Design a protein around this ligand. Sequence first.
Ligand SMILES: Cc1cc2nc3c(=O)[nH]c(=O)nc-3n(C[C@H](O)[C@H](O)[C@H](O)COP(=O)(O)O)c2cc1C
Ligand SMILES: Cc1cc2nc3c(=O)[nH]c(=O)nc-3n(C[C@H](O)[C@H](O)[C@H](O)COP(=O)(O)O)c2cc1C
Ligand SMILES: Cc1cc2nc3c(=O)[nH]c(=O)nc-3n(C[C@H](O)[C@H](O)[C@H](O)COP(=O)(O)O)c2cc1C
Ligand SMILES: Cc1cc2nc3c(=O)[nH]c(=O)nc-3n(C[C@H](O)[C@H](O)[C@H](O)COP(=O)(O)O)c2cc1C
Ligand SMILES: O=Cc1ccccc1
Ligand SMILES: O=Cc1ccccc1
Ligand SMILES: O=Cc1ccccc1
Ligand SMILES: O=Cc1ccccc1
Ligand SMILES: O=Cc1ccccc1
Ligand SMILES: O=Cc1ccccc1
Ligand SMILES: O=Cc1ccccc1
Ligand SMILES: O=Cc1ccccc1
Ligand SMILES: O=Cc1ccccc1
Ligand SMILES: O=Cc1ccccc1
Ligand SMILES: O=Cc1ccccc1
Ligand SMILES: O=Cc1ccccc1
Lengths: 332, 332, 332, 332
Amino acid sequence: YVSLADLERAARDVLPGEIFDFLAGGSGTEASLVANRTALERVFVIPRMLRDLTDVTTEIDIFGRRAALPMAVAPVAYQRLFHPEGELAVARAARDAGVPYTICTLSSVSLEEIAAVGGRPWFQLFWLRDEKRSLDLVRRAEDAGCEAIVFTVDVPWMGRRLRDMRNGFALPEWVTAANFFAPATWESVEAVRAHTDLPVVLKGILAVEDARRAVDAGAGGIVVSNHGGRQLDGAVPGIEMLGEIVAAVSGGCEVLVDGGIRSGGDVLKATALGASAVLVGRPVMWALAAAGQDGVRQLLELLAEEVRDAMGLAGCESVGAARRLNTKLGVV
Amino acid sequence: YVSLADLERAARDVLPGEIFDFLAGGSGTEASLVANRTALERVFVIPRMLRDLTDVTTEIDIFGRRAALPMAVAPVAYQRLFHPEGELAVARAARDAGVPYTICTLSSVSLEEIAAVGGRPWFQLFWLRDEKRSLDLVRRAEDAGCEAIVFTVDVPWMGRRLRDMRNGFALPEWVTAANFFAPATWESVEAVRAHTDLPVVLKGILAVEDARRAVDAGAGGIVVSNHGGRQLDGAVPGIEMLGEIVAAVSGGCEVLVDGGIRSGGDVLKATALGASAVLVGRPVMWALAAAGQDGVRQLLELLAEEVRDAMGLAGCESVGAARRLNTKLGVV
Amino acid sequence: YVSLADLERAARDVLPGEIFDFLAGGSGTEASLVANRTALERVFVIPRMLRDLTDVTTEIDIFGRRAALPMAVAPVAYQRLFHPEGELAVARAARDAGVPYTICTLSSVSLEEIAAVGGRPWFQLFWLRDEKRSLDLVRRAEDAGCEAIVFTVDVPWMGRRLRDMRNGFALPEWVTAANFFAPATWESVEAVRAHTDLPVVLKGILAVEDARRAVDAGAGGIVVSNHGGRQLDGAVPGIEMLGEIVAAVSGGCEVLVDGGIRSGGDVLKATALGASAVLVGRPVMWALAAAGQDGVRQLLELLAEEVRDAMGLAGCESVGAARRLNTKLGVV
Amino acid sequence: YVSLADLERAARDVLPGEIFDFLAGGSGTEASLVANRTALERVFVIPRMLRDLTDVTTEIDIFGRRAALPMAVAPVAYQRLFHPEGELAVARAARDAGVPYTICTLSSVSLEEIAAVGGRPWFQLFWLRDEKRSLDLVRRAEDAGCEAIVFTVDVPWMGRRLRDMRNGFALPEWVTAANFFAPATWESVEAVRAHTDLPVVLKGILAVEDARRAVDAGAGGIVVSNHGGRQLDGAVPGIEMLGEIVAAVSGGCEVLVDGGIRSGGDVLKATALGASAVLVGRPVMWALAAAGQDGVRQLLELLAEEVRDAMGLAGCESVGAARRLNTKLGVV
Ligand SMILES: Cc1cc2nc3c(=O)[nH]c(=O)nc-3n(C[C@H](O)[C@H](O)[C@H](O)COP(=O)(O)O)c2cc1C
Ligand SMILES: Cc1cc2nc3c(=O)[nH]c(=O)nc-3n(C[C@H](O)[C@H](O)[C@H](O)COP(=O)(O)O)c2cc1C
Ligand SMILES: Cc1cc2nc3c(=O)[nH]c(=O)nc-3n(C[C@H](O)[C@H](O)[C@H](O)COP(=O)(O)O)c2cc1C
Ligand SMILES: Cc1cc2nc3c(=O)[nH]c(=O)nc-3n(C[C@H](O)[C@H](O)[C@H](O)COP(=O)(O)O)c2cc1C
Ligand SMILES: O=Cc1ccccc1
Ligand SMILES: O=Cc1ccccc1
Ligand SMILES: O=Cc1ccccc1
Ligand SMILES: O=Cc1ccccc1
Ligand SMILES: O=Cc1ccccc1
Ligand SMILES: O=Cc1ccccc1
Ligand SMILES: O=Cc1ccccc1
Ligand SMILES: O=Cc1ccccc1
Ligand SMILES: O=Cc1ccccc1
Ligand SMILES: O=Cc1ccccc1
Ligand SMILES: O=Cc1ccccc1
Ligand SMILES: O=Cc1ccccc1
């Protein structure tokens, strides 16, 4: 595989159509799904030349741990839909690559099983029916050795995914929510913050004032995101809000971005716009579908080489240097 | 049906081509018809997160009455072209959904018949040959229980609809103007205002100074509109003027918009740009053609669910909150 | 015919390909030819409503004569290429419609013959080999009753028309320059100005400072133009310079525009951007090819109806009112 | 041949696919390769009229020598891939046209052989393994009569050219680096500057501050360039940075540009944006592939005629006048 797009073609060949559509799809007309790509494609980097590249490193420190790349695997529910080893295949590959893996509340293998793989597991939270049960998922994750709580804040309920409606998609019998909902509010955030000493990271922030309030609320991070175009159809891409958000928080929490990251050059763009790191979703699932654990490993190796290549071509010996790159908007 | 576009495909299957073209078409090169869609597609919403959604409501108060959604059925002439029950089918569905229905001067069923259906009927006025006759349509509508007079101000004469010219389109013998023209001026507006205590709503305003003068003239509302691209070919879309107009009137009348609204997400965009409410035209006729009254009911149910979904995903428990959302222009 | 585009299809059917390509083509990659259309299509008009349209008139006064429309027939060389009656057919139709016709230095019928048709003939000048001969064409035109000298200033030499090169195009033997060159300068302009009391109109101005210098030089008008994309490939469209030029001359001469005018709505756009009038080239030749004099008459009747329709839909009882319309740039 | 695009079609016919792909390709998704073209196509020139064109000249003085056109042949490695005479064919044609030819460090004929052709040879440097060897290539080039050292500064390592990866491309046995690497830094630049009295020209500058530092470092020139989209995928086109860079250096060194120059009109655009001169890469290789030396001669003759045509149509008797032209950005 020489690009992430080789993995999409391979996954489309193997997966049943309805499962590929569950993975690929967005809400509504898929305007936000398409815009994630449009927005990255319009961004051009202004590279620097003639800088020392003796010791180029793609490593970052985030939430108290070194990561090999400025990237983590996004939370994607129900990974046994894609391969029989599901979450465990992906988590093992992530661990071996040195990148954090986000364990989902709707994982198809229990969070404790996945955490036992090792590595840098984070845990993604959906707010449940009651405060007490939500907090017991958080405590389970903490007890299992997860390093951060990624509280998804863009899902008061799930968006309208028309592909899934048209296909009548449902989980096969052999895929379940192995860890076993209500709209979250700022009160819910405070309940979680008070319940754990782990960093709380709010995923699905797009308004500048929500980013500021996240810092004020004691978040350790945010993920600037439209949920891969799966929630509000017409929501702005995160990449379009990122520079404004980075300025507004002015170092008060880590600022991650996701949506449409499909290469190491896209990772460079995100960092040049101010991101601490990115999440990658769909491509990880394509690799899992195509070739299981070894597929995910190959994807992460490819991304690592693309990120190193882009950084050095742009004159950046470190991710911090990449954050200081300037950008220019173009057309098409 | 899971989107309004499913209803267009269904209506195209059933209607005779020349009738579909009367419905679908615009004037000239159809530049304004296309631009209505282009303009909405370029608008992205910046949603808010973590707000209380216990009691999300899509209701609004307008012209002294509660409406179930921030939407009314636009005036569309000659609805018996589309289904044999024509206006009565649509009016019954609108009533049962709690949304206002605009009775046309060129209705194919008499205004009194349609008003007798109940609901929240408004009445759309075309200025006639003489002041006295125009005013007698207005008084008829008022006597029949219509709640607002929607004075169409963008039709000194009808635009050049080339599809209709090419097809040699004419009304079938079995469709007539069941209520049975000259260019309206500001004097005409004053004559109507003096003749009725109902709110007068000027439909087809696009210039900012015309919006201000409408308020000064005692209008209770305006509809910011290029008449669905059927009048001046090259007229700006209403959605492109709306934010400027909302600012200029600064609460002095209700500001509605129409043209290309095709989803609850489009309704959210319009409200985020400052609209009090939208009108929907073509899609209502697609539903009527496809399945009569029950079709229109299904369309309104679908729109209601899309509007609620979009509002809540965007953090809005009320339409007023939606009006306070910010937006960003994108590409394609 | 219900649009000017119906006439292009008709002309393409009848003309030999190499002649159609001589007519249709531009220089180079045809970027400026395409951009003339792109630029008009991006312009949207903000129409006004509720104004008195009792006496809508499309007439203007220009160069001391009333014209029926704010339009003249552009200079197009060698009109016998398109129809055997050539210039005389077009001139007769123009006369009968009340619009000026521009007689070309490279006309295929002598300027005196064409002037004898009557109407409002103008005369287009290419600068010759020597001052004395150039001035004798000007004096011939004046003696024949031409009303204005349209000095073409964008042709130091002819552009590179690749269609014509690829086709090996040459004039048939039966088409000649019936009135029978060097680069013009500002000195040439002064020589012409001193030689005639007719208004001198400089055609092919695009830089703002050239527009100002034209006024200072005693021009009675300019035509803001890239020569229909036939001269510099990459030259800005005139419509893109027009508003800036209108502001800079601040009423010191008439400011016409050409390039891509294909409807009465395009005429309205040009006037809203500040043009006194437009020239129309290719479409007049399409009508001539399709149906001779009667074709040109039908085209002018169609344009007159489109201009009246657009003006009134936009609330303009006069061309001066149209000049006061505002515009908004859109997309696609 | 009447455009440079006729030469691409001819080269595609003759070359083996993998060699055509080595020539045509870019890195990654080829976004920067495409953007070079997009960016030029969006630029429109505002031509001037009525200026004296008695003695139009396309000549410039650069690096102490007259050149016939504001253009040089870009460095392209391994020209024997394209034709058996390789570099010698191109160098002879360049010499006979009066335009500089850039001899590559990775030339397939030795630099001394190519320099012996005569003309205005420049020499392109890739930084080697050690300072001493790099400097001995520079001294070789100087001893052979090269006039400038074009130090390529955008290649710490070669970009990821996916076409070449997919094709498994390798040099045939009969093509070698006939003159026979590490990342260059600002120290490397100083070492070269101290070693030669020839002008040092830094090729691959895109950041404004890198342009300024180049002047401060004693460069005689820069080439504003993204390496034809072959290095960082997502790097801004040089043409998009050029105006800003020209302003920042404020005459302190020559400022060249490359990437996508495909006509004399593109040369005019570059000069209007402030370039001293352009480089042309791919098209020279197309001509070499199509017809060897005589092909390159025909290409240079065509470009010379296009540059003269564009300059004069734009009112420019000299390249300096062309630099004073203004431009406007358009769409598509
Ligand atoms: C099939 C699928 C399932 C997802 N499940 C979750 C989830 O359970 N929790 C969550 O916070 N995000 C979820 N996401 C959103 C991703 O975490 C991420 O925001 C999104 O996929 C955008 O990134 P991409 O373009 O890299 O896929 C899901 C995405 C997909 C495609
Ligand atoms: C077939 C048809 C007939 C119409 N008749 C009228 C009318 O009688 N009065 C009026 O004010 N508007 C009329 N309109 C305009 C609509 O009220 C509305 O402004 C327009 O359809 C734009 O909305 P849409 O894109 O939702 O269709 C008509 C529209 C259509 C398509
Ligand atoms: C076939 C052809 C011949 C032309 N000949 C002349 C000419 O002799 N003199 C001149 O000033 N312009 C000439 N023009 C330019 C036109 O006057 C006008 O500027 C141009 O056609 C743009 O308008 P259009 O898009 O309406 O064709 C010619 C145009 C065409 C298509
Ligand atoms: C096949 C190929 C080989 C190249 N080799 C070199 C090189 O050895 N050194 C260098 O500085 N640039 C090299 N370049 C880049 C060119 O000098 C130039 O920057 C680029 O081709 C952009 O111009 P174009 O669009 O005119 O091709 C190469 C380009 C191509 C296409
Ligand atoms: O978009 C995220 C998602 C998560 C679980 C089920 C369906 C969708
Ligand atoms: O159906 C899954 C879900 C997840 C979070 C909130 C609401 C629903
Ligand atoms: O307007 C900001 C922006 C940022 C990234 C991509 C597109 C737009
Ligand atoms: O565009 C509105 C309309 C109304 C009646 C007849 C024809 C068209
Ligand atoms: O033909 C219908 C009509 C309506 C209003 C004004 C003029 C004409
Ligand atoms: O320029 C304002 C605007 C508003 C909505 C859509 C497109 C443009
Ligand atoms: O573009 C104008 C023209 C005029 C005469 C001959 C060829 C072209
Ligand atoms: O070939 C026609 C012509 C016209 C004006 C200037 C130069 C050439
Ligand atoms: O930038 C001004 C403009 C004017 C008309 C069309 C396109 C652009
Ligand atoms: O892009 C330039 C190049 C040079 C030598 C080998 C391969 C590529
Ligand atoms: O492979 C060729 C090369 C050239 C310059 C730097 C690194 C590699
Ligand atoms: O924004 C500057 C620019 C310059 C040339 C082409 C495109 C953009």
